[PDB]
């Protein structure tokens, strides 16, 4: 039901963030891509 990111050799699920991910191109370019929230720790830290 919920998406995560994890180290391939041992299941330890992590929150999908811009610390755990990087970007290239756009959503039209990649085969098999899906829709999901990418969180960012800087957001509550600015807002609070």
């Amino acid at each position: 039901t919920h998406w995560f990111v994890t180290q391939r050799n041992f299941y330890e699920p992590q929150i999908i963030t811009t610390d755990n991910t990087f970007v290239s191109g756009n959503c039209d370019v990649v085969i098999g891509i899906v829709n999901n929230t990418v969180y960012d720790p800087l957001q509550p830290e600015l807002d609070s």
Binding site: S24, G25, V29, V30, I31
Partner: protein, 49 residues
């Protein structure tokens, strides 16, 4: 995606080129058949034994 990452070429270099990579691979496997169809001289390593 991992394979390419294992040679320091980041995962997205596969995904931004995936059908091109599969065409290069399909072309290369095709050339193996034509090479092995043409001649026995490649298998000298076995026909010598």
């Amino acid at each position: 995606a991992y394979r390419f990452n294992g040679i320091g070429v980041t995962q997205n270099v596969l995904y931004e080129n995936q059908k091109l990579i599969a065409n290069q691979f399909n072309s290369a496997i095709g050339k193996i058949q034509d090479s092995l169809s043409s001649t026995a001289s490649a298998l000298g390593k076995l026909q010598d034994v």
